[PDB]
Amino acid sequence: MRFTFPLMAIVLEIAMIVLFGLFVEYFELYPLFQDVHVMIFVGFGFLMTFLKKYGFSSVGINLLVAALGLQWGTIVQGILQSQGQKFNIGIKNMINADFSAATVLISFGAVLGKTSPTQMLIMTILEIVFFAHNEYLVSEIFKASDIGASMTIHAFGAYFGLAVAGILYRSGLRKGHENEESAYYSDLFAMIGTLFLWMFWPSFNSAIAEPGDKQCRAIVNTYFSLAACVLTAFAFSSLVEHRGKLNMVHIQNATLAGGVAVGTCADMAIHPFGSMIIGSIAGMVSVLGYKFLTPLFTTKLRIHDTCGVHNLHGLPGVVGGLAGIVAVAMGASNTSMAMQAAALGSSIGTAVVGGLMTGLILKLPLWGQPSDQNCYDDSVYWKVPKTR
Amino acid sequence: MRFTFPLMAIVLEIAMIVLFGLFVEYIFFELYPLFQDVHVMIFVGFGFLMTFLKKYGFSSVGINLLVAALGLQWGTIVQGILQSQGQKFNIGIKNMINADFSAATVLISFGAVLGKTSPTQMLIMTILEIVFFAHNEYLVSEIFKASDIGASMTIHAFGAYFGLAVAGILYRSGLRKGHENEESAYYSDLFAMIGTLFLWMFWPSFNSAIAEPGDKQCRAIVNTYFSLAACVLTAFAFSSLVEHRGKLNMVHIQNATLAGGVAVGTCADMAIHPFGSMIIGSIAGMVSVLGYKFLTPLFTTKLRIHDTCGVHNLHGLPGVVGGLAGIVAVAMGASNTSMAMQAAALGSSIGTAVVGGLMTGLILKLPLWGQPSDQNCYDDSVYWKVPKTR
Amino acid sequence: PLQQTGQLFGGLVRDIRRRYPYYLSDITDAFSPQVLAAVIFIYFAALSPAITFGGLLGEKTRNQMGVSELLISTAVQGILFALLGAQPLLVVGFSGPLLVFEEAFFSFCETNGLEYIVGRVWIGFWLILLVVLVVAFEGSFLVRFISRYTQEIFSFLISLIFIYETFSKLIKIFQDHPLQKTYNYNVLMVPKPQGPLPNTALLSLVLMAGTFFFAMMLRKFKNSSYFPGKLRRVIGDFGVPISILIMVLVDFFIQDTYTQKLSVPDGFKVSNSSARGWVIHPLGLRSEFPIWMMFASALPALLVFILIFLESQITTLIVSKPERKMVKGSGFHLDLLLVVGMGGVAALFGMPWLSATTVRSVTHANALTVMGKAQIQEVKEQRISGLLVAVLVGLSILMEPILSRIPLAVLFGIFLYMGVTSLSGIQLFDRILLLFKPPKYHPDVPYVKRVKTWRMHLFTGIQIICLAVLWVVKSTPASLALPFVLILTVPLRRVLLPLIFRNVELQCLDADDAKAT
Amino acid sequence: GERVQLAHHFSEPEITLIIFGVMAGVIGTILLISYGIRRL
Amino acid sequence: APVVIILIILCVMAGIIGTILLISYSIRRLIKA
Ligand SMILES: *[C@@H]1O[C@H](CO)[C@@H](O[C@@H]2O[C@H](CO)[C@@H](O)[C@H](O)[C@H]2NC(C)=O)[C@H](O)[C@H]1NC(C)=O
Ligand SMILES: CC(C)CCC[C@@H](C)[C@H]1CC[C@H]2[C@@H]3CC=C4C[C@@H](O)CC[C@]4(C)[C@H]3CC[C@]12C
């Protein structure tokens, strides 16, 4: 049925309107919110536009998924905070809504090109619930320090997408696809999203930090972590390719691993040299992952990651969680170390379980999945112009 | 003849310099964050949103930049003169946010006559339309004392119907059936998505810049945020509904997703509740998609009014919906001020837009400004040195 | 459509297979101003009977079922029927025979000391059993034995009842405020005037006359030769809304004179909160419900089933004649099942069961009827009109400030227009007019040119005797036997009439497709 | 409900489910009897 | 309790979508044959 997507979108919008009527009531953090907003809707949106025949779907489904996600995440996170009571909408609620949208977009990066918009709406709805429950658990039960959300956002979304793609495994696409190839101007467009993410990541890691020392420490640590990560990503991208060539996938993605891996330790007093070391290790790990672990996952473990979001969010997210554990062990934080370990493990496990359940739901042949031949093609769901 | 464009531009710039010397003399570091976002909206979102044409990207973005740059100098002059009543006035942050709102109105009007006008015609249209817009908005804000903080009436509807009037006067019989250059390309649509996303993200600052600090500004931000959120979902749903085989159309995603922000402008600062803002956004998105599907062909083929960007379906119809929503919100006790003044503001905005657009199009229709032929419409090569390679 | 398949639920699926393929057309066909004018017409045409019958039911049952319950039931059943029925042009709502049954059942419960609403719940429970069996065995195949004879008799009788009640309301208005030389200027107005008031009945008569006159004038202007054709037809489709607006403004500009207005409930609440709630326990609210009444409710359930079945099926026959250009199909089995099931469900909620009323459905079909350049061209067969009517009836409570300024006299003129326009599709009415015409002026139709004049006049006179008897039945306390007396004409047509009429005369005079035998 | 009502062993959902089950059983019995008839 | 409310909302949305899809599939299978 071709009417599944508009019907589902209208029903979801009506449900959001009813929930905002039932549960929702009525400024120095606004520029940081705008920076996070620009990240969510431009950086992730254009970062996935590297495919030559899937730019329309990537950017449009990014916008649609994040627009549904901010409302649904607002409702779910507010309900979890207020124990089922009404709550006021401030700037922090909008920031956390954009964070939930970020998690859903990170998951969407894994199954890009092999899913329908209807599947994306369903995955958004389920993933927001799972992510918000995990985030509430980490923030209020374990009370870990994850101000940059290496474990609760990046690792969670990465492993959620990995589980969804593992359930949604296609045997015909395991050896590659003719449409799964980048273009010149498509990579040029992806650099826009890469640059915007890199420029505004300190606000991502310092939006909801405690005002004062912690916020400044988060800003400075994120900035220097990214500065080191860029150089190390370039170096290792040259190292792992033939004749020292630079691979555009590495420059587009791995340059952002420093922000992910410094997220847990952002507000800690790890010093700029420590942040630079973390960013360097993150860039090295991301490049090594893209070079070697992604084909290993695709061919042997039967888990296809379209954008390689594992190498950008999961491995740097786990690195950031372990860095938080070490930094607590070194006295850089007054949190519990066992709580940081529990937060990392619980984030990974909840992501895997929720991804398995959501992928099992999405495998039902009702949502208009593309055929194996038509994967990574805009013409399945969009009116594509005749010329490029 | 050949020097008309630079000569007119230098004369206008010298006039602006003289007027600034005559009338203009020199909280700010608080609203500056929001000004930066409006400037990014005015100079990037509108600039690239209209670059969807496959052979008109250069003229789109460059004439957008030129028009907005001259507008921020002319709108400052005219609005400061109107507020100060002919006396010298000092320029602060609010003075340069209103000058970017006048530029926004002129760019909305540009969206209607895109691809069929010369840069000289755009200079003339900017100069006249800023005067008409400033007088209408002074009337609405001070005589009628209507609440139009997001300017669904003074900016969006005004610019949309101004551009419709200008396109009606500048009607070309050869372009009624269509043109070979009036179609999109893949990467041109990606640039249009760049512009769309920037407008969509920075619209809350656009609506809440002039709002009273405190509760009203926060209400404006929240209402715009959730109205746009609802508008995206409904625009996607109805774009899938109205198109053939359920295929999404990029024009709908590029334009109709901003209709929620357009329509919530009048009710931005009011206590219309987030559910009310989401309802307004959903209705605006549905109306915009339906307009793009049905009414624009009716406007082009039957009413002899061609709308290149479909700025009617994005700014006028959602703008009129926003005016009606403001009237209803005043009725439902959501704010102060009378219903009659909101209705008078909407009517005066539409009427002044139509009359000023008629006069401006009559001045533009003169065979003096080097307007292109019917063959060369939507082609960059008429005014720009286009590279051989794409 | 009336054939017996022999398969269990065969007629149900056949009706499902007939109309549901046209579902996308049922939404797209409604994007026209004529559908909107039909919605505006049928909104009043279904709300005013709903309000009046809810008031009467609350008065006669001590507000155990009232205006709000009737409005809610009407909205729910109309939405479900427009979204699922195979004849969406039918209008679902309360009717007179249902009110008579409610009065009789309330009297029976009061005499025997039984709980009226719990007995209603049990009767509605018994209704679901009856209609499932009838649809399963294709009990709707017996409708094929109702010819144009019974259909036209029932339609003419129902139109006469509607017009007579419309005039009797005006008679009641005149009697309540008679024309007197002097009046008491100090009369209490809440809840109703306690004495005669000056200028009330005469202004109501003026409003009713103006409404009917302007409705007829704009209907004639639809078929006239004035103005451009598009604007002329747009105005003609909106003749009823324009007449209503003109007369409402006329009454609004007169402030001193009192006129009775529409009254709606204050909010979505039960009429009597001290008696029952929204959900009624089938085991009893105040006292334990007797076991014997659970089984004894079958006979009243049978009577209600007969009433609803005959009413809805004859209405479906009338609104879906081949001569009315209904080229999308109708579902006899599905719609009957849906109507009786929704009635049984609404009985569980303390709400009245509903059936397809003839007058409102025929007006709704005629509102969407497109006349060619005379000759019926097509019908805007779509589901949006009935759904919108149901939604507006449900929302009538929330729009009290608008409905409180509409006089009943304008609605009376609208009812008169509906009654006089409901007689168009009846050949019995046409033959009645031929009783006062010279034989040479009679039209060139098969039933006149092939049958002798006195034979046709005798055939018409026999039907009038049946009409007069049915009028006697209505004006007697045994008015619940009316469907049986109407059924008794089926033996009259198929047994007694052939003894005095030839086969050719019967074929010409009673033709399903108006053919010359 | 409303005001004071007598308390029964079965609640309203329970009693309506029991009644619906009895009705479904009766309908199934009638359908099976009809299926048996017109075959032998 | 917030978890109960969120699960209830998910159950309502899933039930609505499932019922609509079930009705559509039943109508399709009755209509095609
Ligand atoms: C609501 O219902 C109650 C009880 O069902 C009605 O109260 C009865 O009123 C009649 C009329 O005088 C008398 O039998 C008694 O006064 C009451 N009987 C009982 C058993 O309470 C009440 O009148 C109803 N309300 C309305 C507005 O009709
Ligand atoms: C035709 C429809 C209404 C079903 C047929 C009704 C008969 C056969 C059934 C349906 C529900 C049944 C009742 C259900 C529950 C009870 C409570 C118990 O303590 C005594 C018997 C009693 C009171 C039953 C009597 C018989 C009953 C009334």
Other residues' Cβ atoms within 10 Å of the Cβ of residue B331? 11
Q: Is A32 helix (H, G, I), strand (E, B) or coil?
A: helix
Enumerate the residues of chain E whose CB falls inside 8 A of the CB of residue C21.
Answer: 31
Report yes or no: E22 at the C interface, CB cutoff 8 Å. no
Integer-rounded Cα radius of gyration of chain E: 14
- For residue A106, give the 3-state DSSP assignment: helix
Question: How many residue contacts between A and E have a Cβ separation below 8 Å?
Answer: 37
> Taking a contact as any Cβ pair under 8 Å apart, which residues of chain D between 1 and 40 contact chain C?
1-3, 5-6, 8, 10, 12, 15-16, 19, 23, 26-27, 30-31, 34-35
Long-range contacts of B331-339 (CB under 8 A, 24+ apart): B334/B267, B334/B270, B334/B271, B334/B272, B334/B276, B335/B147, B335/B269, B335/B270, B335/B271, B336/B147, B337/B145, B337/B146, B337/B147
Question: For strand B89-90 and strand C375-379, is the pairing parallel, antiparallel, or unpaired?
Answer: unpaired
Annotate A364-378 with DSSP letters as a single string. STTS-PPPSTTTT-G
- Peptide linkage before C97 cis (omega within 30 of 0): no
**Token match 């042949």: residue?**
A365
Closest residue by Cα to residue A333 from A218, A247, A233, A232: A218
In this complex, whether D and C touch, counting 3 or more CB pairs under 8 angstroms, is yes
Indicate whether A64 belongs to any domain. Answer: yes
- The residue among A63, A193, A378, A199 whose CA lies nearest residue B197 is A63
B224 Cβ neighbours under 8 A, 6+ residues apart:
B150, B203, B204, B206, B207, B208, B261, B264, B268, B277
Structure tokens at E5: 């409310």
Q: Which of D22, D23, D27, D29 to mutate to test the pocket of ligand 2 (most atoms within 8 A of CB)?
A: D22
Give the CATH number for residue B93.
Answer: 1.10.3430.10
Cβ pair C277:D15 closer than 8 A = no
Q: Which residues of E touch C23 (CB under 8 A)?
A: 27
Q: What is the dihedral of CA B89, B92, B94, B100, to 10 degrees?
A: 90
Residue B145 lies in a domain: yes
Q: Which tokens sit at B119?
A: 């840069």
CB C331 within 8 A of CB C131: no
The rounded Å distance from CA C117 to ligand 1 centre is: 14
Is residue B235 assigned to a domain? yes
Is A293 contained in some domain?
Answer: yes
Please tell me the distance between residue C125's alpha carbon and the centre of ligand 2 in angstroms.
11
- Plot region of A291 (φ>0 → left; ψ -120 to 50 → alpha; else → beta): alpha
Pocket, ligand 1, Cβ cutoff 6 A:
C 62-63, 272, 274-275
| Ramachandran angles phi, psi of B25, nearest 5° | -130, 155
Mutate one of E3, E11, E12, E22 to test the A interface: name it (highest A CB count within 10 A).
Answer: E3
Cα separation, C188 vs C170, in Å, equals 22
Whether B230 has its CB under 8 Å from any CB of chain A: the answer is yes
Structure tokens at B4: 């008309």
Q: Please name the residue ranges forming H helices in A137-212.
A: 156-167, 184-206
* Residue showing tokens 């619980």: A346
**Distance from the alpha carbon of residue C274 to the mean position of ligand 1, in angstroms:** 8
- Looking at residue A51, what DSSP letter applies? B
What distance in Å separates the CA atoms of residue C61 and residue C72, rounded to the nearest whole number? 18
Strand partners, C92: C356
DSSP H helical ranges for chain A? 4-23, 30-38, 44-47, 55-82, 91-108, 117-136, 156-167, 184-206, 213-240, 248-253, 257-261, 271-288, 294-299, 309, 315-329, 337-362
Enclosing H/E stretch for A168: none
Q: Is residue A191 part of a domain?
A: yes
Provide the domain count of chain A: 1
Q: Residues C498-506: contacts with CB within 8 Å, 24+ apart?
A: C500/C458, C501/C455, C501/C459, C504/C450, C504/C451, C505/C450, C505/C451, C505/C455, C505/C459
Establish if B242 touches chain A: CB-CB under 8 angstroms.
no
Report the 3 state secondary structure along chain B.
Answer: CCCHHHHHHHHHHHHHHHHHHHHEECCHHHHHHHHHHHHHHHHHHHHHHCCCECCCHHHHHHHHHHHHHHHHHHHHHHHHHHHHCCCCEECCHHHHHHHHHHHHHHHHHHCCCCCCCCHHHHHHHHHHHHHHHHHHHHHHHHHCCCCCCCCHHHHHHHHHHHHHHHHHHCCCHHHCCCCCCCCECHHHHHHHHHHHHHHHHHHHHHHHCCCCCCHHHHHHHHHHHHHHHHHHHHHHHHHHHHCHHHCECHHHHHHHHHHHHHHCCCCCCCCCCHHHHHHHHHHHHHHHHHHHHHHHHHHHHHCCCCCCCCHHHHHHHHHHHHHHHHHHHHHCCCCCCCHHHHHHHHHHHHHHHHHHHHHHHHHHCCCCCCCCCCCCCCCHHHCCCCCCCC
The answer to whether A196 and A42 are in contact (CB under 8 A) is yes
Q: Say if ligand 2 is within 6 A of residue C485 CB.
A: no
Distance C70 CA to ligand 2 centre (A): 28
Cα–ligand 1 centroid distance for C62 (angstroms): 7
* Domain encompassing residue A106: 3-363
- Tokens 């009454």 identify what position? C251
Question: Which of B382, B379, B388 is CA-nearest to residue B55?
Answer: B379
- Tell me how far apart the alpha carbons of residues C302 and C293 are, in angstroms, rounded to a whole number: 14
Structural Rg of chain B based on CA atoms: 20
Question: Is the residue at B377 inside a domain?
Answer: no
Sign of CA dihedral A94, A100, A101, A103: positive
Q: How far apart are the first and last CA of chain C?
A: 22
| Contact of B133 with B102, CB cutoff 8 Å | yes
| Preceding-residue numbers of gaps in chain A (C–N over 2.5 Å) | 26
DSSP state, residue C481: G
Phi, psi of C261 (to 5 degrees): -110, 170
Q: How far apart are CA D8 and CA C516, in angstroms?
A: 66
Q: Which two tokens stand for residue C372?
A: 């060619």
Residue E2 and residue A79: Cβ atoms within 8 Å? Answer: yes
Instruction: Verify whether the Cβ–Cβ distance D2 to C284 is below 8 Å.
Output: no
CA–CA–CA angle D7, D8, D11 (5° rounding)? 105
What is the C-alpha end-to-end distance of chain E, expressed in Å? 48
Six-digit token pair at C475?
């004006």
Instruction: List CB contacts of C89: < 8 A, sequence separation 6 or more.
Output: C319, C361, C364, C365, C368, C379, C381, C385, C386
**Number of helices followed by number of strands (H, E) in chain D:** 1, 0
Q: Is residue A186 part of a domain?
A: yes
> 3-state DSSP call for residue A309?
helix
Q: Is A28 on the interface with B (CB under 8 A)?
A: no
DSSP calls for C314-335? HHHHHHT-GGGT--S---HHHH
Buried-state track A374-385, b at ≥16 Cβ within 10 A, e below 16: bbbbbebbbbbb
Q: Give the closest residue to C504 by CA, choosing from C495, C516, C496.
A: C516
What CA–CA distance (Å, rounded) separates C104 from C96? 12
Give the residue among C273, A370, C321, A37 at the shortest CA–CA distance from D5: C273
**Interior CA angle at C129 toward C126 and C135, to 5°?**
140
Q: Which two tokens stand for residue B54?
A: 């496959």
CA distance linking residue B345 with residue B365, whole number of Å: 29
Tell which residue, B122, B117, B83, has the closest CA to residue B106.
B122
Question: Contacts of residue E17 in chain A, CB cutoff 8 Å?
Answer: 8, 11
Give the whole-angstrom CA distance, residue A185 versus residue B187.
8
Number of H helices, E strands in chain E: 1, 0
Q: What distance in angstroms lies between residue C342's CA and the mean position of ligand 1's atoms?
A: 29
Taking alpha carbons only, the member of B42, B247, C500, D33 closest to residue A60 is B247
Ligand nearest to the CA of C191: 1
Interface present between E and A (3 or more CB pairs within 8 Å)? yes
The string of DSSP letters for C330-378 reads --HHHHHHHHHHHHHHHHHTT----EE-HHHHHHHHHHSEEEE--EEEE
What whole-number distance in Å separates Cα of residue B158 and Cα of residue B262? 12
Residues from chain A that touch E1, judged by Cβ atoms under 8 A, are: 83-84
Residue C272 C-alpha to ligand 2 middle, in angstroms? Answer: 28
Q: Are B337 and B146 in contact (CB under 8 A)?
A: yes
Interface of E with A in 4-33 (CB under 8 A): 4-6, 9-10, 12-13, 16-17, 20-21, 24, 28
Distance CA A117, CA A63 (A): 11
* The pair of three-digit structure tokens given for residue C348, joined into one six-digit string: 């569980």
Residue A90 lies in a domain: yes
CB within 8 Å of chain B, chain A residues 74-113: 89-91, 94
> Which of A7, A75, A133 is nearest residue E20 as measured by Cβ atoms?
A7
Look up residue C30 and give its amino acid: A
| Separation CA A7–CA A117 (nearest Å) | 12
Q: What is the resolution of this structure in A?
A: 3.0
Q: How far apart are CA B304 and CA E6, in angstroms?
A: 53
In whole angstroms, give the CA distance from residue C172 to residue B44.
Answer: 73
Instruction: Count interface pairs C-E at CB distance under 8 A.
Output: 11
Q: Are B342 and B285 in contact (CB under 8 A)?
A: no
